[PDB]
Ligand binder design. Structure first.
Ligand SMILES: CC[N+](CC)(CC)Cc1ccccc1
Ligand SMILES: [Mg+2]
Ligand SMILES: [Mg+2]
Ligand SMILES: [Mg+2]
Length: 340
């Protein structure tokens, strides 16, 4: 029973959910990892980890992934949720020095994860373990591209720190550009390739149909998170949300901003349906009779299928996850799963 303001009949009808067969083992292995890496207090892992649905999100997205690949992705994605919470708490508590240090340590650990596996900051050590694991699947050129993308993500989070401490709400286009980075669009897109077992050549992954399909998948997911997480974010003085930027800079009411964000999300869906046809036709064109053409064809088809799966996984995640259930909290500004 999705709230009417969030319900998207086209997702529910035309994007049937998928679940990776490794999901039951993934759930418990990631929860054990969060425990053993001390990424969340033991009592909060026990009360909340499963209800957060982080592994469910990844297992509905990277279909076809080798189990070991999906495990590293899920650990890394759970880490990224804990990092979002740490960033939030550093801003709320004014810990600009602790944030600047963490920011520098994540840049360094991203380039040399092996050196940071036992770092005193458990958030850095957990980061390093998952990244080292992700670096073991594909050639070093893929690792370099992952790192280049995530160094950009870290700096976008630094920009968020400064906006929120100065109480600056970005403008709408400013925000849309920043959101492609704080949502980690290009990391999810990069992770498609170890999930289908193939580093794609630049010529294939920069093909306009592949690029546009990948963009729209992520714009849908980021803006649907904005639509669904707007209440928790207003309650916690978050400023980064397309709806907040519309209410703040365009005098829209809550109702009007929500309607506009919905319309933008819906347009992502139908633009995706159009370019999906071209991206799958390109996957067909890559199968040229050769072994290599078959490899690339199958990899592009799997990645475009997972671009599609991201729509339904993100849609349902926001209605199942404890992360967004702000009406259940005694303190609406402090989620119970965050370390305060
Ligand atoms: C807070 C988690 N995340 C991961 C990119 C930022 C670290 C955004 C996100 C939210 C909801 C669904 C998917 C991703
Ligand atoms: Mg957040
Ligand atoms: Mg955030
Ligand atoms: Mg959000």
């Amino acid at each position: 029973a999705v709230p009417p303001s969030l319900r998207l009949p086209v997702i529910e009808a035309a994007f049937p959910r998928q679940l990776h067969p490794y999901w039951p083992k993934l759930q418990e292995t990631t929860r054990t990892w969060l425990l053993e890496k001390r990424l969340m207090p033991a009592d909060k892992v026990e009360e909340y980890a499963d209800g957060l649905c982080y592994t469910d999100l990844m297992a509905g997205y990277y279909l076809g992934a080798p189990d070991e690949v999906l495990q590293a992705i899920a650990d890394y994605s759970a880490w990224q949720f804990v990092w979002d919470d740490r960033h939030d708490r550093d801003i709320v508590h004014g810990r600009a020095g602790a944030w600047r240090r963490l920011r520098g340590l994540l840049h360094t650990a991203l380039d040399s994860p092996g050196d940071h596996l036992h770092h005193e900051d458990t958030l850095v050590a957990g980061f390093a373990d998952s990244v080292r694991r992700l670096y073991a699947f594909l050639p070093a050129t893929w690792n370099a591209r992952f790192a280049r993308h995530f160094h950009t993500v870290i700096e976008a989070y630094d920009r968020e720190f400064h906006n929120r401490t100065r109480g600056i709400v970005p403008g709408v286009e400013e925000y849309l550009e920043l959101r492609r980075l704080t949502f980690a669009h290009w990391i999810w897109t990069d992770l498609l390739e170890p999930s289908s077992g193939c580093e794609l050549p630049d010529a294939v992954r920069k093909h306009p149909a592949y690029r546009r399909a990948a963009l729209l998948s992520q714009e849908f997911a980021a803006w649907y998170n904005d639509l669904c997480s707007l209440p928790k974010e207003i309650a916690g003085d978050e400023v980064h949300n397309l709806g907040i930027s519309l209410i703040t800079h365009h005098s829209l009411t809550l109702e009007e901003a929500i309607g506009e964000v919905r319309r933008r999300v819906e347009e992502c869906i139908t633009e995706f349906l159009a370019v999906e046809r071209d991206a799958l036709r390109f996957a067909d064109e890559l199968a040229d009779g050769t072994v290599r053409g078959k490899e690339l064809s199958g990899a592009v088809r799997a990645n475009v299928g997972n671009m599609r799966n991201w729509f339904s996984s993100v849609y349902w995640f926001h209605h199942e996850s404890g992360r967004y259930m702000v009406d259940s909290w005694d303190d609406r500004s402090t989620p119970p799963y965050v370390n305060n």
